[PDB]
Symmetry: D2
Subunit: 26 residues, 4 copies
């Protein structure tokens, strides 16, 4: 469970950064 | 932008799958 | 923990649908 | 599209916060 939660956390954080990039590009 | 959005949304769908498995394990 | 996981699951699923909308609109 | 993306990314940031709390509770 620990490893899976860490991976979701990582990916969610990356999404914030990617979506902020998209917002700026749009 | 379209390709990046698709990668993000596919990962969001994987999060549903992973969270559902965490629910089962808990 | 159960209630919080359910809410994240719900929201992730909604994001798939919203992001697929954005993909179509773009 | 920009407003919707902002709502999504703000929720992604909340998921990091919520997942981190779940880690602590577990
Ligand atoms: Zn995400
Ligand atoms: Zn991702
Ligand atoms: Zn992921
Ligand atoms: Zn499953
Ligand atoms: Zn999401
Ligand atoms: Zn949301
Ligand atoms: Zn949420
Ligand atoms: Zn916290």
């Amino acid at each position: 469970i620990e490893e899976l939660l860490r991976k979701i956390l990582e990916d969610e954080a990356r999404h914030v950064a990617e979506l902020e990039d998209i917002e700026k590009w749009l």
